């Protein structure tokens, strides 16, 4: 996260840290006691699926304070329409091997209904994005969880406000832009998979997933986020399904 602040411990309780072989891989979002939403692209290069770990209640990577809960990731479910190495449909649904225990420091973010998200949440201007990603483009990653308030744009507006770079991925209906074009504030690659969370009448909801962008906090460019509202039905159906052998599952989308 570039240009944000430390998330006070416990105020980002749905934030997930994903590790492979002990090394930080990506962020994610807890949406109930066994399911985590992350980005599909986080898993493009994984070979040993048995070493994939989700940590809840994490805050400071340098210390263990006892609020951390680690779980093996039993299944990673990705839309059939996602193509590794590209940008579209950048979403994954992770089933934990054992539920986390909800506490003051571990709480799910609400996955909204589609209609509520499209008709109401999509028009809340500002939302929070968070993670242990890079503090600067080409800089070091954060030891404490960081959070940033970013404004959402209509996609027409994004394309008009953004500099043209050529070869740039299209911004599809399964994405949206949020952030700032002055080079000051953005999420970054190490925040991939983490929450874009939106407040409405007292409660926070999952609306986006940190997905991609041109560098980090690059002048003329905004962060691009997976538009979670397109996937509500897909996610809900999967969360009602029985587990299948093998960690990776490609599931039809729609």
């Amino acid at each position: 996260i570039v240009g944000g602040k430390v998330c006070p411990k416990g105020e980002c309780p749905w934030q997930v840290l994903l590790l492979v072989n002990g090394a930080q891989l990506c962020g994610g979002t807890l949406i109930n006691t066994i399911w985590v939403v992350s980005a599909a692209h986080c898993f493009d290069k994984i070979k040993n699926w048995r070493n994939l770990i989700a940590v809840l209640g994490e805050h400071d990577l340098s210390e263990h304070d006892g609020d951390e809960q680690s779980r093996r990731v039993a299944q990673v479910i990705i839309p059939s329409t996602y193509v590794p190495g590209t940008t579209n449909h950048d979403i994954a649904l992770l089933r934990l091997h054992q539920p986390v225990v909800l506490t003051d420091h571990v709480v799910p973010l609400c996955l909204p209904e589609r209609t509520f998200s499209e008709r109401t949440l999509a028009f809340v201007r500002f939302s929070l994005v968070s993670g242990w990603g890079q503090l600067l483009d080409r800089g070091a990653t954060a030891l404490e969880l960081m959070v940033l308030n970013v404004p959402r744009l209509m996609t027409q507006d994004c394309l008009q406000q953004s500099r043209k770079v050529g070869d740039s991925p299209n911004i599809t209906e399964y994405m949206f832009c949020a952030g700032y074009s002055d080079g000051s504030k953005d999420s970054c690659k190490g925040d991939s998979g983490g929450p874009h969370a939106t407040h409405y009448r007292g409660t926070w909801y999952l609306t986006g997933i940190v997905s991609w962008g041109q560098g980090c906090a690059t002048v003329g460019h905004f962060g691009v986020y997976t538009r979670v509202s397109q996937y509500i039905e897909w996610l809900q159906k999967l969360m009602r399904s029985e587990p299948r052998p093998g960690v990776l599952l490609r599931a039809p989308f729609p």
Binding site: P108, T115, Y205
Partner: protein
């Protein structure tokens, strides 16, 4: 009705035939008698931050 200001609902909104509207809530919440408000039914409802709620 639901398209305008979320039908007045705190969380979810369903349209019905005519000027009928039903508000609903996420699991872990129940709807109050005003027909719009949602109140937690569990200790750790989604989307609420305990250390701030307890202040």
């Amino acid at each position: 009705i639901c398209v305008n200001e979320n039908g007045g609902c705190e969380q979810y909104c369903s349209d019905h035939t005519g000027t009928k509207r039903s508000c609903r809530c996420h699991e872990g919440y129940s709807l109050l008698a005003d027909g719009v408000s949602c109140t937690p039914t569990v200790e750790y409802p989604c989307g609420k931050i305990p250390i701030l709620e307890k202040r």
